[PDB]
Amino acid sequence: TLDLVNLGVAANFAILSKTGITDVYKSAITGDVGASPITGAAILLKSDEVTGTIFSVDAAGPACKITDASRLTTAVGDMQIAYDNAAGRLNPDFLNLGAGTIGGKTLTPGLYKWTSTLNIPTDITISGSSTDVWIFQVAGNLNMSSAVRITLAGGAQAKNIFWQTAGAVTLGSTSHFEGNILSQTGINMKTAASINGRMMAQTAVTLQMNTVTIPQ
Ligand SMILES: [Cl-]
Ligand SMILES: [Cl-]
Ligand SMILES: [Cl-]
16 A cells, blocks of 8 residues: 655645745645745735734745744755655556546546656546545646646545646646645646645745645
């Protein structure tokens, strides 16, 4: 059975980036948010958008920010460790499933790899037990089209789903994502898309009136 990806201190964040968090008011984020090593001024959220704590590396940022460089440095390091962990998993159960487009599929537990960009243009289901683990390795971008829902079935839990992407992630408007995202570049959400999962970007996270909830 596939091991979880240990997020370390990054597990405590709904959104964690390295070059900031952009936002088209109003979003609704549940969980802590942070960015490092960029200045906290690059976190463009307000306090009424975040249920939790906004962490900054310095004295800049939203009014409600907490300055804690050492925690952010550990979280971002742990985020990098998790990204490398997840990208380093060997012996995939699936390789280039659906030839890079996977609309309509039901995904069972395991390690999946794509040597291209992955597209999700219609609804999909992730199906498994409450202890099963999915790891999706994407060597290109990860795209999901407008209004696409990812449905969880059989007891599958968002906290046991990990998406590792070497390129940028784009979630289209009204879409609904499930699982943790470890992006090597950005994670870009569009108008009123939602995610039950974490947004861990090694560049920036950009939002447009999104709902972001940390997995329970
Ligand atoms: Cl850092
Ligand atoms: Cl990769
Ligand atoms: Cl846009």
